[PDB]
Design a protein around this ligand. Structure first.
Ligand SMILES: O=c1[nH]c(=O)n([C@@H]2O[C@H](CO)[C@@H](O)[C@H](O)[C@H]2O)c(=O)[nH]1
Ligand SMILES: O=c1[nH]c(=O)n([C@@H]2O[C@H](CO)[C@@H](O)[C@H](O)[C@H]2O)c(=O)[nH]1
Ligand SMILES: O=c1[nH]c(=O)n([C@@H]2O[C@H](CO)[C@@H](O)[C@H](O)[C@H]2O)c(=O)[nH]1
Ligand SMILES: O=c1[nH]c(=O)n([C@@H]2O[C@H](CO)[C@@H](O)[C@H](O)[C@H]2O)c(=O)[nH]1
Lengths: 810, 810
């Protein structure tokens, strides 16, 4: 059908059809008479999977032959989403499979919707790991993703009575055709026990054993025949476990609960023992696997030359003391040599400066669960502080500020300090974020070892986030500049010479209108809700959090509603405001924000006077697959976090690449996006980081804004009086109280400028031609935000390896 | 290689090899360089499985087209063992696969040993269900086996310090290539709740829901292209289950524990709630499946004409009240009509008369877990007793004896009485057993409804128990009379005309010697233990129980040892005594019997004076796969249960079919075996049932035997003094006490005759030629014990269907 989807050759279509029928018969054990849509989906999945195996086997054989330096990306989250379409795109099989299924009398798009999302992540951090794996394979790096195979991923969100309800994400229910169990590589992981100090070295004994069984999933690079591996560990009890008889067998569940479920917290630390076990479980199994592969290449001096370990946040921070344990206790290396190897092998990526998100584990927990690691951490701390004392003699406060051990109510271990001390590189995820790290929270560390600190601005993969979710846009672009940009996004700059091209302007606007019509139809199909496709699609999708300020968006929506009610027969640019995202189960305020959104919609969407001029819809169960649908249909991207709180943001990049203009604060990657496109082509507003600091020094008083802004006062009075909750007048009392007395994120402070800025947005939308020309200027300069650029920087500046765009023989 | 293993055609061997390589590549994702023996086993399993699918799909389509009466065999146990070789045998692919793997440079026998046994059963009862499925498919019946897919089957037995140690049987660890999940047929099962009586009928509400997910396994008939289905249910929690968040997800384990593990009790009732849940779980899911299939053929009058439900023991007895519940509460049929349909649909098989094995569930348990079923059971009881009262006016004691409800400490429901009342046929499993049912335990019921009682003597499948485990014997037999006997075992009688044939006599003896050499080698291979292949292989394998009297065997062994020590230089026929079997985890006496066996071996096997004249070995982890190895190598089969206790026995039939002579009591099927072969060709000894009754009436006093038999007294004194347990002199005090003061099975009473009989056995073994001629007379008359004969009788006399030997187009 479309160019960028590859060729539909005669031979290939014929081959695909016969293999599809073979799998339906032999694999699914069914015939066309009793086969269900799900049966057809699996028949197609197995058919596409077959095309991966050959490349998968030779890629790994290749690495064995060439023995290049290996990159190990450790993360407790991999937000993969669906795999079928992504695999077809990277193998250039989309059109052939589309044709083949068509001839079999089937609609491939219908079958694609049957696949469950692999929701092994919460949001940005988990998605970043997924985009990175794609880019590493596309850049020919010998990379491996290591994580946990959660039985239950992020919960499915249901909205009942306007409230969020959570239900288990049993994604493995019907089976996963993409994974391959490798029980032959099962490894033992130890817990509890005690430390014995013998003649030669310490020994960790009397431990409880839990087995780690790996499951491998293929990660195909973009049309380069490279297929890397994502290995996820599953917990298994040993057969002699607890061995009444029946009860002993049933208690196996205890040990296996380790890989049962993903903790649903986004940017928030919850110090639960089960979480600590998950963190050590992935680290312990992964390192044994790494060392095994290394020995199968005694000379640990060359370990850093053949191995690079990237820690995604502090979640896998235990890799540092665990590597020391193995080298010192098992391999018998002297401490100094072991430490040298560890530091040169490990690199750490920091993701958010919010204090409530930092991992600080109680010493009593580590003491009971990992006694040897606690001892190693104390020793690391002792030697690190000796270095600090020698560099800054007499600076006693610096010593306590930098310690890995925090004193107080309960002693805790600051995992971020542990990661900085044991890594040769520490990076932030956006220029402004990395600068904040050096200027504030890690100032002491930067002064001691300035060379360790770097910046690696985040990115997104243009495969899933353009070609896959927005084929129409990828096509009109390819028509003008070719297909090379798909793996070299910087080439999009060539589109700048088309900003005045009437044909192009018209095509860009047509693609957007088509995406909006498709999404508008989807809303009625699966969610039965009417919306006007001619309105401006104003969307904010991301996890619900106070710092992301979905509340500021709500205030604007209510402002628009009150203005309309005041002057009913006055023209206003029609808008469909869409807000979506999940709230962590125990985050009360976030759950109240969701209720507020649906409550506003209940009032606005049923007011006769408003008509189709304003609609407020809450996008239920926002996840990767839904993002792929709504982002291509958006006109306006809301990135309005308080300056200095959003480390980077990645959703913002997805919107920019798909033809939406951005309204946001100078926070995270927004700053670099505006810099790339030009501030005149971005809708910037609000306080800058410096402004926020000035306000804090002075003392933030929300009352002041309430007293001086009539429109704001009206809104707060409506909320307090029960205007949006008739049967429950004080339902939103907690929200009003927080906004008025303890708003850590200064919602009111940016209210006026935000509303003003939104007016400028509506003004531009009234001029279709100029709105589109600004869109083109955004798409044309979004190249810097490809994760291929990000990974190339990690490879050269941190891992010490060169990326390759060379194809492998298929 | 051998005739009975089919042809190794040029085309087929070529096809098998390419498909084997295809699976190793695409299915296992490996190459010949990294493939392990397990990888090769799976490659072979998937290759053979492919040959099943076509026949499986058309067999089921066939039943849909012809709509024959369906037979549903409900059992909580299906002791299947391995599936690879059995599948090749029934598809006539053994030689082709042997050749194909040979050419690939692989040993098929080595690969077959890699497959895990499907140990979803405890012993005879579970194995009977497995043999039955094979015969039903071979006889072309539209039959379905319904059970539970236990995650953990019967525990693996380890012997440590002479004691039994149990370890979890994680048989699904590496995956099961034979099963096919059918999540599309997932059904809800209800528990707890309460009963609401409305205007029209009662309603079961406020229940907890557990999902039942079916897994289908193919059951191939012998070379007739028929492939039936064994459907096993797995428990799954609903996604809204219990929906802190984390804990709610982790608590899903509670509900899913239902299908977690098989209760390891053999011939013993343990009234645990979890077991009751398993029993209802299988019954509830199965009946919904049956009714669905029935409606997809309103007219429940014809239900009994299209459906037959066979209850294997009382374990699935809840099918009766559950069928009534559905018909009355859901379909709205009047009670009388519903009862008529139920009785005509259900048939019940009784398996043992031991009182401790009878299921008698506490009313308080049924009251809380299945409130509606308890009400239905009371109503059934009320109407049944009204019938009894009318038939035997004034016989008040008969009323209390026949009640389904037992009064006393705690009220209980006698499930056997429930089954008799609600079934149109009740059968015993051996002639003597069925007679005992009518004369004793079910006398009252027989007098009320004599027509209901029948006999169906057990049998074993000649496919697994001859062709598969003893190809050498099947071959020399085929050479003389053809291959027809494999599916018509009665033809073995033709071998009687070869009893004087010198060539045949020599071949029979050669095959046995070969089997013994092979087994003797196996013992050293996997268990490192030396034995003399020239000795008489005396074996007793079956679950450890007091009624089976492994203790009587022990007394004989010790007698032989004491006699040798007394007259060292006197000649005696060499023997290797082998005893094997598992003991239920909580059965103390059985565990003590195992310890006694190993203790005897410790003394006997290391006594210089004995030499290789006597060896005592305990066969560890006795299971189906081990039975297939030891039975073909046996010379003497020990079937020595106290007369009247072994309902039938089936191991006895396996030994008779494989060339071993039998020493046993006139109990269970032993009586019919001796009758078929002729008492002169059997080694019968001990009390008959009538003798046991006389002793009980008089009062059994073990002391008498001890006082009058010097050799017996010596043995008991050795046991008491610590002769077999030096470091622990009183280790066997419990055994001696039981034998002397409360032996329910009269071990001493049969001691003298047993030892005398064993002397006659040794006398015959000294004459190779005559021993073999007697063996031939046994094999020649073992035809009656084929499960094909058993199933043909069930089909004609109970289910109302005609068996067919017609092939289906492949
Ligand atoms: O994901 C979450 N983010 C949050 O900000 N919180 C918040 O943490 C605060 C510090 O303990 C509490 O005071 C708040 O009541 C709580 O909502 C959560 O409980 N969960
Ligand atoms: O637990 C967390 N979850 C997250 O999603 N993040 C996020 O990681 C992203 C990738 O670097 C950043 O772009 C986001 O700004 C950050 O909030 C965190 O920093 N921490
Ligand atoms: O499988 C088993 N078979 C048994 O015979 N027993 C027996 O049941 C008897 C009745 O309660 C007890 O008195 C015995 O001590 C026990 O070993 C078991 O505990 N388990
Ligand atoms: O729990 C039980 N397990 C058993 O193995 N049996 C057995 O079932 C067999 C098949 O009918 C019989 O041949 C055995 O004699 C009987 O003990 C029972 O009767 N009960």
């Amino acid at each position: 059908q479309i160019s960028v989807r590859g060729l539909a050759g005669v031979e290939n279509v014929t081959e695909l059809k016969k293999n599809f029928n073979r799998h339906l018969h032999f694999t699914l054990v069914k015939d066309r008479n009793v086969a269900t849509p799900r049966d057809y989906y699996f028949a197609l999945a197995h058919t596409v999977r077959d095309h991966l195996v050959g490349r998968w086997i030779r890629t790994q054989q290749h690495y064995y032959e060439k023995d290049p330096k290996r990159i190990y990306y450790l993360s407790l989250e991999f937000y993969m989403g669906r795999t079928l379409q992504n695999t077809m795109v990277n193998l250039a099989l989309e059109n052939a499979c589309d044709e083949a299924t068509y001839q079999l009398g089937l609609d491939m798009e219908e079958l694609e919707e049957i696949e469950e999302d692999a929701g092994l992540g919460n949001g940005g951090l988990g998605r970043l790991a997924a985009c990175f794996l794609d880019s590493m394979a596309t850049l020919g790096l010998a990379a491996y993703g290591y994580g946990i195979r959660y039985e239950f991923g992020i919960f499915n969100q249901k909205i009942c009575g306007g409230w969020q309800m959570e239900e288990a994400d049993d994604w493995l229910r019907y089976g996963n055709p993409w994974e391959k169990a490798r029980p032959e590589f099962t490894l033992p992981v130890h817990f509890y026990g005690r430390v014995e100090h013998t003649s030669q070295g310490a020994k960790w004994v009397d431990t409880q054993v839990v087995l780690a069984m790996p499951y491998d999933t293929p990660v195909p690079g973009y049309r380069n025949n490279v297929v890397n591996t994502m290995r996820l560990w599953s917990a298994k009890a040993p057969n002699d476990f607890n061995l009444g008889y029946i009860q002993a067998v049933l208690d196996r569940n205890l040990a296996e609960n380790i890989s049962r479920v993903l903790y649903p917290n986004d940017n928030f630390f919850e110090g639960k023992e089960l979480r600590l076990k998950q963190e050590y479980f992935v680290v312990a199994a992964t390192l044994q696997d790494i060392i095994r592969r290394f020995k199968s290449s005694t000379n640990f001096d060359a370990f850093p030359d053949k191995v690079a370990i990237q820690l995604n946040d502090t979640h896998p921070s235990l890799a540092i003391p665990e590597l020391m344990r193995v080298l010192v206790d098992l391999e018998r290396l002297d401490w100094d040599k072991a430490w040298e190897v560890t530091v040169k092998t490990c690199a750490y990526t920091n993701h958010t400066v919010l204090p409530e998100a930092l991992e600080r584990w109680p010493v009593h927990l580590l003491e009971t669960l990992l006694p040897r690691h606690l001892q190693i951490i104390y020793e690391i701390n002792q030697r690190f502080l000796n270095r600090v004392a020698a560099a800054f003699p007499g600076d006693v406060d610096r010593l306590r500020r930098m310690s890995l051990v925090e004193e107080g109510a309960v002693k805790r271990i600051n995992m971020a300090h542990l990661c900085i001390a044991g890594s040769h590189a520490v990076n932030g995820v956006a220029r402004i974020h990395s600068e904040i790290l050096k200027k504030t929270i890690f100032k002491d560390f930067y002064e001691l070892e300035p060379h360790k600190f770097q910046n690696k601005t985040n990115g997104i993969t243009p495969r899933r986030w353009l070609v896959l979710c927005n084929p129409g846009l990828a096509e009109i672009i390819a028509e003008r500049i070719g297909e090379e940009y798909i793996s070299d996004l910087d080439q999009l700059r060539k589109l700048l010479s088309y900003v005045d091209d009437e044909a192009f302007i018209r095509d860009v606007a047509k693609v957007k209108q088509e995406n909006k019509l498709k999404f508008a139809a989807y809303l009625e199909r699966e969610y039965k809700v009417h919306i006007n496709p001619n309105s401006l699609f104003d969307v904010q999708v991301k996890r619900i959090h106070e710092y992301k300020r979905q509340l500021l968006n709500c205030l604007h929506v209510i402002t628009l509603y009150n203005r309309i009610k005041k002057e009913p027969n006055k023209f206003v640019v029609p808008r469909t405001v869409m807000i979506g995202g999940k709230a962590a189960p125990g985050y009360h305020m976030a759950k109240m924000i969701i209720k507020l959104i649906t409550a506003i919609g209940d009032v606005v969407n049923h007011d006769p006077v408003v008509g189709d001029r304003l609609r407020v819809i809450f996008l239920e169960n926002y996840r990767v697959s839904l993002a792929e649908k709504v982002i291509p249909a958006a006109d306006l991207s809301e990135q309005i976090s308080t300056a200095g709180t959003e480390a980077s943001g990645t959703g913002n990049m997805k919107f920019m690449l798909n033809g939406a203009l951005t309204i946001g604060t100078m926070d995270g990657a927004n700053v670099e996006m505006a810099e790339e496109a030009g501030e005149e082509n971005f809708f910037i507003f609000g306080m800058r980081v410096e402004d926020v600091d000035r306000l804090d020094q002075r003392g933030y008083n929300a009352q002041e804004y309430y007293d001086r802004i009539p429109e704001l006062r009206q809104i707060i009075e409506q909320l307090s009086s029960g205007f949006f909750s008739p049967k429950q007048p004080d339902l939103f009392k907690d929200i009003v109280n927080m906004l008025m007395h303890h708003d850590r994120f200064k919602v009111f402070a940016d209210y006026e400028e935000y509303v003003k800025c939104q007016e400028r947005v509506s003004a531009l939308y009234k001029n279709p031609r100029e709105w589109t020309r600004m869109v083109i200027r955004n798409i044309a300069t979004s190249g810097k935000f490809s994760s291929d650029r990000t990974i190339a920087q990690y490879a050269r500046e941190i891992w010490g390896v060169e990326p390759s765009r060379q194809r492998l023989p298929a």
